[PDB]
Amino acid sequence: IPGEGHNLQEHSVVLIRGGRVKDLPGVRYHIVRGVYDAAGVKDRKKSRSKYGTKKPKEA
């Protein structure tokens, strides 16, 4: 799971992405965020589309 925090629980229906992460041994995938149970890493302002965070409504 990329990003800080996660409403990811236990019986969470979630979308894998693919792309082995270097550190954790034998973890070859990702959870793409902003689909099904996994949600947008909250209040990321920068690299957003990669974390499924919808554009913040500027005042």
Partner 1 sequence: AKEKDTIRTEGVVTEALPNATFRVKLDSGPEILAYISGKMRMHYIRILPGDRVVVEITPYDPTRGRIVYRK
Q: Which residues would be at the binding site for RNA (CB under 7 A)?
A: 2-5, 15, 17-26, 28, 32, 34-35, 40, 44-55
Task: Find the shortest distance in angstroms from Cβ 59 to Mg ion.
Answer: 18
User: What's the CA gap between 1 and 32, in Å, rounded?
Assistant: 8
Contact between 49 and Mg ion by CB under 5 A: the answer reads: no
Tokens standing for 23? Answer: 């550190």
User: What's the CA gap between 15 and 31, in Å, rounded?
Assistant: 6
**Which amino acid makes up residue 27?**
V
String marking each residue 3-42 x if it binds partner 1 according to CB under 8 A: -xx-----------------------------------xx
